[PDB]
């Protein structure tokens, strides 16, 4: 069964890419409209983004807690910019407050040098090694270990957590991107590798280069893929939807459009097609070892109902369950 | 009018101090019970504490957003472990998602080996040093400025917020500290000075200083007092309740009990008496020039009802109002 | 300023009229998605329908109470089938629980003889006279009057309300339809007359025949109109939307389609056009004395965001306010 | 396991009986405080009363839906003033909107001149007559049947539900009545018999009868007892609390106080004692064959916490669970 995730557009949303035409204001009330739509439709979770152009994701995720019952929140976590101890207490609180629905996604991100804006100036090599030190402590702190640590970048003493998360050993850990050295910090520490939506070929390959660097540390790793979606009644209708999405400003693979990448942000590619054809490329990707799909659409409210109504009926989607209350 | 605040006991709650007896489990559902209590009884806001013994305050606070309409959240802000930038982004996000209901509280940090846990190893001098840098950058950042600042502790380059907070010039900033270096930082940068409950005299003097040290900097500051409360219908039942509270393990001033201080839990003093009395002492404090009172009790849900039913009626309370949604 | 209402499709919803293709399941979670969309977008209220094919409207309306803050609920009330006393206690509770957001719409309805299914067999003449007796008691009970009454159809003794509604003299009363004798029960007792969306002509006339029968009792009466809406970027796009809405099975006035009436239920007509043109026919109707507009669309979630994003910016819409809490 | 229920004091609440002193205002926000209390403490359901002194139970109940996840609602059903059909539609809507959490309680009605208020003028014989007709039609209607029934009071033709309830064969039906005609109606049509708290003996006998009068009709019925509770840590504090409760205006059996009956408010008896004692008496009752206990207290929020913290631990409580959302 597949784990279908939607997305919280906390950087902004709308009907058209590249322009304020058809724009859609984003506030907690709209963000809650999407999270609840997702909770209601069967999505396992929702990816909540990171970056200084986005409302803070921990806050956004935690404010959706009393209003959803089974949706999980995939909060993007930038190692380098925060203490691993703090990050382990926040992660613990998120998991507890939501009763086991916290999920974390490690991010380091190359461009821009936004790190500077946040008092971080490590080299591409230093951030990737600090990231590795960060999540080692984090992984250890979330397992009840009192941690004394002082490597190149991270330095803590008697680091201990008074209250544990609920998921075990710790809330799952996801890692996106590709790079090269990136894949390593993952193969050695994360539970699932997130990859941009590329043609099956380039993707089958990255699954190997990843699965291998993981096996070398004798560990199993999962895969998810981040795609944009533009599904409709018919392909005719879907290509038109796609063109119009770009109309205020590419099929690099069967029903794979980089039209969405024609702008400085997002999922670069989108599965454009009718119901059975998008289902087809989706499964195809699942045949390659992808068990999770982080989809998206503009606008995200209406589009989550489309992928949920046109796609889900044609897929073996993993339907999440509301967890029972922890006994008092 | 007086601004009455309550407390979210994110560290734990119960009817007894120092033992697991009569304890009460704290979780999202019980914190919401109190938050929602506070919102309806008319408390202006609610203070949410900081420390390794506490669920993370930002998350806890953000989680009460969709479920309270007027209540404000006094959240702890830590100048050392977090970049002033992120902290500026979080403050803004919190303020926007709640539509203007965020307030911050500066916590410089103490001992023993706790800060060592978050990887911050600085001297009592250096921390108050880092705080001033920190809040100078945070305040500036929340005012749409771009920042390049390199002091003894804070190094930020090109730091700027893409999205603005709602309140101007920024979400109020509260601060405490009997320390000498502290009242200074407060008189210069903070909006409200927060002091523990103490006999009228000892507090007059603390208010005397600060109000002067502030004016010298060409500004008017505000004062609030953190008292634990134990009101009842008679003084006899009050003392009885006070005595009961400790029963499993002091009156430094007319109906001002230090009993609550026996254990390193919560505030140190507590008004203890019937209504008209506690009101009266509340009014003395008011007279000094204190417009805000951050009360608390055990257990914190039943007590919020106690202070809202026996005390509010005898006081001139500022009724918080629900902010109209921002225009779309 | 205009009072814009949306609609809660408690009989079912979807993308296409007359067929289960594109259908959309309706539950409390979806019904809450629409109510909240409406609360968030600026709609004064939402019309919640009556009939044995619909989830009970009082229940649906009351279950949206803790989740909305300013939306009003227009609950359809069929006089003949329930006691006026009960109906006055339920109306009182709805208004109190929502803090003044209850609105009631009187309905009698001709076809079908569904009344039978509910133990009601009065003649067309008997229901219209029982309706009149019903709301006379209702109007009186909601004004604190102890009521002794026994006419043809209604009979009560010592009828009194222990708790009053909040709106005064009573929650507003709306009346739909047309008929002839119908207009009378309205002109003599209701606050606003609801009329099906007909061309400006036939509508200007009904406003008179109504305004007159009201003036005869020396009272003022308001008007609202119930239309379906199909608004888009351009008229080209909107006519296509319209055709496709019917595609699984008429412009009786400029941009007025009875296509939607091509099925056994709904608003018979729909304003089909781009933004400025729908705005135009809307104002036109307002020029005639319509101060309230009950709009609708398929699906109702997505369509409420369309009318809210394409239409509202072009109209002088009355933006509702969240009412402050009744003081304790 | 025992099924513990609580009470929504829609008529009023406070710490004292018979006077406005120590009173507490009841509104949606406080009822939700208790409903939400009940949901988290593990009470199976909550009883919401009927009468002119009460906010309407259906509305009150429906309003707690989006905010509770497992708690059930015991709502009053009135056979005389409402058609059995509507009542069938409402029951179904309530059951569906809450996803299977509705339970009904039959109330036949008493004196004095109250029914006269709702336009129902029938004799003590005729009302129990109308009840049986009523619930026979309601039960049949909730089982997808079409109905034509003309008895001494209920006249229905072609009555049928377009949408089904969730629970089968229908939402449980509870009933009370010491009356002779009552235990009969109960043994034949109801799911659970509800009796006031009485000394073990007097209740054994009532249970003896009913269990027989039911089997004769070829069916197993269930029993529940409506007790007011006053548990504390010692019996002394209990009696003290019991005495305090009346202080502004009796032990018919070991720790079974009739004091709560001095005023026509709530139930007539009340268990009064420390934990292990009250548990014990709860267990006696259990033994008789009572699986459900509908408790209450003053004020009803603080008390639900009292009974859930001092009593539950000493009992074998049936932990309600959250129902998984119906498949889409």
UniProtKB/Swiss-Prot annotation, chains A, B, C, D:
Keyword terms: Flavoprotein, FMN, Monooxygenase, Oxidoreductase
Quaternary structure, from the entry: Homotetramer.
Assigned protein family: Belongs to the SsuD family.
GO cellular component: alkanesulfonate monooxygenase complex
Misc: FMNH(2) which is absolutely required for this enzymatic reaction, is provided by SsuE.
Domain of life (superkingdom): Bacteria
EC number, as in UniProt: 1.14.14.5
Catalytic activity: an alkanesulfonate + FMNH2 + O2 = an aldehyde + FMN + sulfite + H2O + 2 H(+)
Lineage: Bacteria, Pseudomonadati, Pseudomonadota, Gammaproteobacteria, Enterobacterales
Gene Ontology biological-process entries: alkanesulfonate catabolic process; cellular response to sulfur starvation; protein homotetramerization; response to heat
SUPFAM superfamilies per the UniProt record, alphabetical: Bacterial luciferase-like
Record function comment: Involved in desulfonation of aliphatic sulfonates.
Underlying gene: ssuD
GO MF, any single term: identical protein binding
Alphabetized Pfam families for the sequence: Bac_luciferase
HAMAP family tied to this protein: Alkanesulf_monooxygen
Species this chain originates from: Escherichia coli (strain K12)
InterPro entries, per the entry: Alkanesulphonate_mOase_FMN-dep, Luciferase-like_dom, Luciferase-like_sf, SsuD_RutA_monooxygenase
Effect on the protein of changing residue 264 to C: In strain: K12 / MC4100; inactive
Inducing stimuli: Repressed by sulfate or cysteine.
Summary of pH dependence: Optimum pH is 9.1.
Coiled coil regions, renumbered to chain: none
Protein's name in the database: Alkanesulfonate monooxygenase
């Amino acid at each position: 069964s597949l784990n279908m995730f939607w997305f919280l557009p906390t950087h902004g949303d709308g009907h058209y890419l590249g322009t304020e035409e058809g724009s859609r204001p984003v506030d907690h009330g709209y963000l809650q409209q999407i999270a609840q739509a997702a909770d209601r439709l069967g999505y396992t979770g929702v990816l909540i983004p990171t970056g200084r152009s986005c409302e803070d994701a921990w806050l956004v995720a935690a404010s959706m807690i009393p209003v959803t019952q089974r949706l999980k929140f995939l909060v993007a976590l930038r190692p380098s910019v925060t203490s691993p101890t703090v990050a382990a207490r926040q992660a613990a609180t998120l998991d507890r407050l939501s009763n086991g629905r916290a999920l974390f996604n490690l991010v380091t991100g190359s461009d821009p040098q936004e790190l500077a804006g946040d008092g971080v100036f490590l080299d591409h090599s230093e951030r990737y090694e600090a990231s590795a030190e960060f999540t080692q402590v984090w992984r250890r702190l979330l397992q009840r270990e009192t941690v004394d640590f002082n490597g190149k970048h991270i330095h803590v003493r008697g680091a201990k957590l008074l209250f544990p998360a609920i998921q075990q050993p710790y809330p799952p850990l996801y890692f996106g991107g590709s790079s090269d050295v990136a894949q390593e910090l993952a193969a050695e520490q994360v539970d699932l590798y997130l990859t941009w939506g590329e043609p099956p070929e380039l993707v089958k390959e990255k699954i190997e280069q990843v699965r291998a660097k993981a096996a070398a540390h004798g560990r199993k790793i999962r895969f998810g893929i981040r795609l944009h979606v533009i599904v409709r009644e018919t392909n005719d209708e879907a290509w038109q939807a796609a063109e119009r999405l770009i109309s205020h400003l590419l099929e690099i693979s069967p029903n794979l459009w980089a039209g969405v990448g024609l702008v400085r942000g997002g999922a670069g590619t989108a599965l454009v097609g009718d119901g059975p054809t998008v289902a087809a490329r989706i499964n195809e990707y699942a045949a390659l070892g992808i068990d999770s799909f982080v989809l998206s659409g503009y606008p995200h409210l209406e589009e989550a109902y489309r992928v949920g109504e046109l796609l889900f009926p044609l897929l073996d989607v993993a339907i999440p369950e509301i967890p029972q209350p922890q006994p008092l």
